[PDB]
């Protein structure tokens, strides 16, 4: 009924790589994890869905394999892991979304986070499916139905509460670069009876972030202040040398874990490396797991 899992995000490889070099990259993933101690301890791969056109991103954005094609490669090179993914619902329409969700579950995915994109319907005829409506409508197809939880966002208490009422089973956080989630989940536990599973998301920040700024872009929220603080922490990690970067990161992790695991929500972990998996990323994830892991 709960995942109680550690999930590693693997973004699908570029469409132009071809099969032979897709599996080589996945083979490197297996070696990096074994070398880092992770190889028994990651139960799920989270494969995010697709943005086709660019959103302003600081990186280049090439066309990717569909979630289904990439998942079959993943199963070849990482036969231990189970599958989670992300699905945009806003563009599909109920019948199409039913077929898509059925195909995902049929091909071995155990949980799906329903993601929404705002769109114009003043024109832009044809309703898609709002993520919160999908949560109710497809509960017979998807046992683990997720939403994005952004604990720094204005009105997230009302927003996440609504999604829980509408049938959300877990919340997957935006990348966490402060302990805002601690106060959010405590206030959420005081104002409501919803106890969804929380997928806590931690992202490795490489020095390259000082030059490219991808993670700063991923978490931006104009005029927030809590996010402003998080962006300063990202820059500081990027400008920190490995020992201090690891310690600052793991101190953040320890505060979140300590502040959260007794609130009464089931807790799972979600590890991202937005610039691509790497030995320093996997070492950071191994350090976090040595402090605390589900089970």
Give a yes or no: residue 237 inside a domain: yes
Q: Are the CB atoms for 157 and 190 separated by under 8 Å?
A: no
121 has binding-site annotation: yes
Give a yes or no: residue 23 inside a domain: yes
Give the CA dihedral 216, 220, 222, 227, nearest 10 degrees: -80
Q: List the chain gaps (C–N > 2.5 A) by preceding residue.
A: none
Q: From 151, 105, 116, 152, select the one nearest 263 (Cα to Cα).
A: 151
Q: Are the CB atoms for 54 and 16 separated by under 8 Å?
A: no
163 has binding-site annotation: yes
Backbone region of residue 175 per phi and psi (left: phi > 0; alpha: psi in -120 to 50; beta: other values)? beta
Please give the full DSSP string across the chain, using - where no structure is assigned.
-----EEEE-PPPBGGG-HHHHHHHHHHHHHHHHHHT-TTT--EEEE-----S--S-SS----B--HHHHHHHHHHH-TT-EEEEEEE-TTT-HHHHHHHHHHHHHTTEEEEEEE------SSS-S----HHHHHHHTTTT-SSEEEEE-TTSTTHHHHHHHHHHTT--EEEEPP-SSSHHHHHHHHHHHH-----EEEEEEE---TTHHHH-HHHHHT--TT-SHHHHHHHHHHHHHTS-HHHHHHHHHHHHHHHHHHHTTSS--EEEEEE-TT---HHHHHHHHHHHHH----
Give a yes or no: residue 1 inside a domain: no
Q: Are the CB atoms for 104 and 112 separated by under 8 Å?
A: yes
Q: For position 186, which CATH number holds?
A: 3.20.20.220
In whole angstroms, give the CA distance from residue 121 to residue 102. 27
Tell me how many domains the chain contains.
Answer: 1
What the block records as the tokens of 202 is: 């931690």
Give a yes or no: residue 83 inside a domain: yes
| Alpha-carbon distances of 159 from 138, 153, 196, 204, rounded to whole Å | 20, 9, 14, 28
Backbone region of residue 225 per phi and psi (left: phi > 0; alpha: psi in -120 to 50; beta: other values)? left
Give a yes or no: residue 144 inside a domain: yes
In whole angstroms, give the CA distance from residue 84 to residue 48. 8
Backbone region of residue 4 per phi and psi (left: phi > 0; alpha: psi in -120 to 50; beta: other values)? left
In whole angstroms, give the CA distance from residue 65 to residue 18. 10
What the block records as the tokens of 225 is: 């202040």
Please, how many CA atoms are within 13 Å of residue 146, restricted to the half-sphere of its CB? 29
Q: Are the CB atoms for 152 and 176 separated by under 8 Å?
A: no
Whose structure tokens read 């190889």?
39
123 has binding-site annotation: yes
Full domain range(s) for residue 173: 6-291
Give a yes or no: residue 102 inside a domain: yes
Give a yes or no: residue 142 inside a domain: yes
Whose structure tokens read 């509960």?
139
59 has binding-site annotation: no
81 has binding-site annotation: no
Q: From 233, 165, 231, 151, select the one nearest 193 (Cα to Cα).
A: 165
In whole angstroms, give the CA distance from residue 46 to residue 273. 12
Whose structure tokens read 């409508």?
137
Whose structure tokens read 């997720």?
146
| Alpha-carbon distances of 86 from 76, 108, 114, rounded to whole Å | 21, 14, 6
In whole angstroms, give the CA distance from residue 71 to residue 294. 24
37 has binding-site annotation: no
Q: Would the CA dihedral through 92, 98, 99, 101 be positive or negative?
A: positive
What the block records as the tokens of 243 is: 């020992």
Give a yes or no: residue 190 inside a domain: yes
Widest Cα–Cα separation across the chain: 53
């Amino acid at each position: 009924m709960t995942l109680n899992t550690v999930a590693l995000e693997l973004v699908p490889s570029n469409l132009d790589l071809g099969t032979a070099h897709a599996l080589a990259e996945l083979q490197k993933v297996r070696k990096l994890a074994v070398d880092a101690g992770l190889d028994g301890r990651i139960r799920h791969i989270m494969i995010p869905g697709m943005i086709e056109e660019d959103d302003g991103r600081p990186v280049e954005m090439k066309p990717k394999l569909d979630v289904l094609d990439y998942w079959e490669l993943v199963q070849r090179e990482l036969p231990d892991v189970r599958g989670l993914c992300t699905q945009v619902t806003s563009f599909l329409g109920e019948r199409s979304l039913r077929r898509r969700l059925t195909a995902l579950i049929q091909h071995g995915f155990e949980g799906i986070a329903f993601v929404g994109v705002p769109r114009t319907m003043t024109d832009g005829e044809g309703a898609g499916v709002a993520p919160t409506d999908a949560l109710s409508t497809f509960s017979h197809l998807v046992k683990h139905r997720g939403v994005i939880l952004i604990p720094t966002r204005d009105d997230e208490l009302s927003r996440f509460g609504f999604k829980c009422k509408e049938g959300a089973t877990f919340g997957m956080t935006q990348l966490l670069y402060s302990d805002a989630i601690v106060n959010f989940l405590t206030e959420f536990s005081r104002n409501t009876d919803h106890r969804p599973e929380i997928l806590l998301s931690f992202g490795f920040v490489p020095k390259m972030e000082s030059e490219v700024g991808l993670i700063d872009w991923l978490i931006q929220d104009p005029d927030n202040g809590a996010v402003a603080t998080e962006q300063q922490f990202v820059r500081r990690l990027a400008a920190s040398e490995p020992a201090q970067k690891r310690a600052q990161m793991l101190d953040l992790y320890k505060r979140v874990i300590d502040g959260v695991i007794d609130l009464g929500f089931p807790v799972s972990l979600h590890f991202e490396a937005p610039y691509g998996v790497s030995a320093p990323a996997f070492e950071t994830f191994a350090a976090m797991l040595d402090y605390w892991a589900p089970d």
